[PDB]
């Protein structure tokens, strides 16, 4: 409604004026179409003589009446007596590559063993794989399908899509029938362009939302679904109708999970129940912690690639929260208690609409890129006096 829009606009203006005191870096950019996915690629190029480096993002498009694109964008990031710091963004964020894509890009993830290969998740149960070096960087226009109706004929598809970082070409996805597909694209034939699943895991009784490989154990993966369950699977097991472990993770749909990159035992899940949960694989009958502060459903949760005790969460609400595990238990004044628990390190208020995805920059600490339904992409870094204190 118009009244809520005005409130949101007022709150954005306040945030924007506050930015120098809350952030060290904020870069914003309006995409032509909203992206439902965001992931930093690992490469950074450092052009000689310049006081910035170049970083790149995989994005996509959500449009229904126009030709969708898998997108690669470049971002210029600064190298390390007046207040503020505002400047122009012109030319700091540019689109390098557009690749025609049939459906909307629900999720896009690069293959860790060769980051030129991007897998994408469509609203159908197929997953597309693209090598962006094998396409032109600017496509010709596309011939759009104009169905006078589209009769939908499948339950939801969750966005779950994870490459195994220890087995090259092994790819998990959340299918549209409560199961999980596994493909192996290493040594696919030369002639064969289509590839069938090596395995189907059945177990969940509702829409599977997310899947993720374990980062160390090559045969372990986790999954979460609308059945309120977290499930740990082992590819070595002969029984693909039952997982190794099954947890009642939450009191509503579980939309996401993420393994902690400094500990083989720790992971986090995020739910429609408005909480993030902390789990230890050595004792999954006990939930270690619950991060409550979010006003709405959690859809994404991601651990800091640089700090073992840091994670961030996002979802339906326009805010993205950053949590510091090391502050769990700390004393607070009663006033600060009202603001939330001490483990809530930072609330990012820059977006004015639902946050679809976000990604921690793997190369510059504390840099995040977040994308929202309003078309906005923000690349930002909170003030060092908040994260060093």
């Amino acid at each position: 409604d118009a009244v809520e829009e005005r409130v949101i606009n007022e709150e954005y203006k306040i945030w924007k004026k506050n930015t120098p005191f809350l952030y060290d870096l904020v870069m914003t950019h309006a995409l032509e179409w909203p992206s439902l996915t965001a992931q930093w690629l690992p490469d950074v190029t450092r052009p000689e003589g310049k006081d910035f480096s170049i970083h790149r993002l995989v994005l996509g498009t959500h449009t229904s009446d126009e030709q969708n694109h898998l997108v690669i964008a470049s971002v210029q990031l600064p190298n390390d007596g007046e207040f503020g710091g505002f400047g122009s963004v012109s030319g700091k964020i540019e689109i390098e590559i557009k690749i025609n894509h049939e459906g909307e890009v629900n999720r896009a993830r690069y293959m860790p063993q060769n980051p030129c290969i991007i897998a994408t998740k469509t609203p159908s149960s197929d997953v597309l794989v693209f090598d962006y070096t094998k396409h032109p960087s600017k496509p010709d226009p596309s011939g759009e399908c104009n169905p006078d109706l589209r009769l939908r004929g499948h339950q939801k598809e969750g966005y779950g899509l994870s490459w195994n970082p220890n087995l090259s070409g092994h790819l998990l996805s959340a299918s549209d029938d409560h199961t999980i597909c596994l493909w192996d694209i290493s040594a696919v034939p030369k002639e064969g362009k289509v590839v069938d699943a090596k395995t189907i895991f059945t177990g969940h009784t509702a829409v599977v939302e997310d899947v993720s490989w374990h980062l160390l154990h090559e045969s372990l993966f986790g999954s979460v679904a609308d059945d309120q369950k977290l499930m740990i699977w082992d590819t070595r097991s002969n029984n693909t109708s039952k997982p190794s472990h099954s947890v009642d993770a939450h009191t509503a749909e579980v939309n996401c999970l993420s393994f902690n990159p400094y500990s083989e035992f720790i992971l986090a899940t995020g739910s429609a129940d408005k909480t993030v949960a902390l789990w230890d694989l050595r004792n999954l009958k006990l939930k270690l912690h619950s991060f409550e502060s979010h006003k709405d459903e959690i859809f994404q949760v991601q651990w800091s690639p640089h700090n073992e005790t840091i994670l961030a969460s996002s979802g339906t609400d326009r805010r993205l929260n950053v949590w510091d595990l090391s502050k769990i238990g700390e004393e607070q004044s009663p006033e600060d208690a009202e603001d939330g628990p001490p483990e809530l390190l930072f609330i990012h208020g820059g977006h004015t609409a639902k946050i679809s995805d976000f990604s921690w920059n793997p190369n510059e600490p504390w840099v995040i890129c977040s994308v929202s339904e309003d078309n906005i992409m923000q690349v930002w870094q909170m003030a060092e006096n908040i994260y060093n204190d």
Partner: protein, 69 residues
């Protein structure tokens, strides 16, 4: 909505530390939509211009498993 860039100045960075008691970063960090008292900060910074180790994950897990929910 207008696009922008912010690379916070060295002076603002030191002002944030100097005027810790006015800014209250711990509080501000959880209140994006409250106006920060920048005037007060700028004043006290210009006036006072003539002058962190983290717990291991292991330790946080030890704390948690000894303070159950």
């Amino acid at each position: 909505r207008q696009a922008f860039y912010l690379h916070t100045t060295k002076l603002t960075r030191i002002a944030r530390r100097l005027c810790r008691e006015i800014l209250r970063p711990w509080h501000a960090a959880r209140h994006p939509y409250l106006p920060i008292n920048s005037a007060a900060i700028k004043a006290e910074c210009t006036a006072r211009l003539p002058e962190a180790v983290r717990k291991p994950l292991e330790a946080v897990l030890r704390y948690l498993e000894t303070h159950p929910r």
